């Protein structure tokens, strides 16, 4: 339930994501891994990489890195009217990787942190402001869509 002078916001701080998308997205699931060892876990793909550097040296989380950040990109840019993009998801990452709605949590705290640590002094509080409410209407609907599934209640 955002404005658009908020979604512009949105729709700016994404476009320095956007410059480059593995990046940004590589570390935003490092810092998820580490900060949360408890998620590798629910990666065949990933469940090997013990040191942060078997992580940073791994192209395959760099790729997956990319889909994360992409679909991700590209629900915001539907500015709250992303019923079509989000089911899909939701039924996805509930269903068959089952993923607790807390860990779409961790990691919207883990784009906010890596929004900082990346642009130290270009990532302003308004905007801040506006990427924490879109995180949220996102974790919002995934939520809506998750006790349908009856999936963790
Ligand atoms: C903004 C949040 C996220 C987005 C947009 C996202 C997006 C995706 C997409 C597009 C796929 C592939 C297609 C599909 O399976 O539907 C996928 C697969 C997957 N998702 Fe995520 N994801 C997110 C966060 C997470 C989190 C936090 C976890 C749990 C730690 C997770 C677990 C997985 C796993 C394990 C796979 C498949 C692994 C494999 O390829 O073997 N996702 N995700």
Redesign the pocket.
């Known amino acids: 339930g955002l404005s658009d002078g908020e979604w512009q916001q949105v729709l700016n701080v994404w476009g320095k994501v956007e410059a480059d998308i593995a990046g940004h997205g590589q570390e935003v699931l490092i810092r998820?891994f580490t900060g949360h060892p408890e998620?590798?876990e629910?990666?065949?793909?990933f469940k090997h990489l013990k040191t942060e550097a078997e992580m940073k040296a791994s192209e395959d989380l760099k790729k997956?890195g990319t889909?994360?950040l992409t679909?991700?990109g590209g629900?915001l840019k539907k500015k709250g009217h992303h019923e079509a993009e989000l089911k899909?998801?939701a039924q996805?990452?509930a269903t068959?990787?089952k993923?607790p709605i807390k860990?779409?949590e961790?990691?919207?705290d883990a784009i906010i942190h890596v929004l900082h640590s990346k642009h130290p002094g270009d990532f302003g509080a308004d905007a801040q402001g506006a990427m924490t409410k879109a995180l949220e209407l996102?974790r919002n609907d995934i939520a809506a869509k998750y006790k349908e599934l009856g999936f963790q209640g």
């Open positions: 998820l998620t590798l629910k990666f065949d793909k997956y889909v994360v679909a991700l629900i899909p998801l996805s990452h068959k990787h993923i860990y779409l961790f990691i919207s996102f």
